[PDB]
From Swiss-Prot, chains A, B:
Annotated domain remarks: The insertion domain (I domain) plays an important role in the folding of the capsid protein by acting as an intramolecular chaperone.
Name of the gene: 5
The name this protein goes by in its record: Major capsid protein
Compartment(s) of residence: Virion
Job description of the protein: Self-assembles to form an icosahedral capsid with a T=7 symmetry.
Highest taxon of the lineage: Viruses
Family from the record: Belongs to the P22 phage major capsid protein family.
Assembly and interaction partners: Interacts (via N-terminus) with the capsid assembly scaffolding protein (via C-terminus); capsid proteins and scaffolding proteins form building blocks that assemble to form the procapsid. Interacts with the portal protein.
Amino acid sequence: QRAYANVNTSLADAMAVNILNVKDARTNVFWADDAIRIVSQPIPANHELFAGMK
Amino acid sequence: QRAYANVNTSLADAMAVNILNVKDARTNVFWADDAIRIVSQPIPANHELFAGMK
């Protein structure tokens, strides 16, 4: 399990939480291409079961 | 404009109007033909948005 470590230390008891967005700002987004996907499934309204609608 | 004048005299200030219905008698109507226009227009139900019906 320790082979998957990312942070160097565990959360302590009294640790203060910093807030990185202090002020309103317009974002700039960057990623490696692989990170985001779009999953899409078809909706079968062409099936025999729907005979009313075109 | 005077070509359209159908009356010899404009309305005075104090002038007696005369209502001609003193009784409930049932009408007898006469007109010169083409005095009543009947306007018609189709209802377009054949459109593809209506496809769920004949």
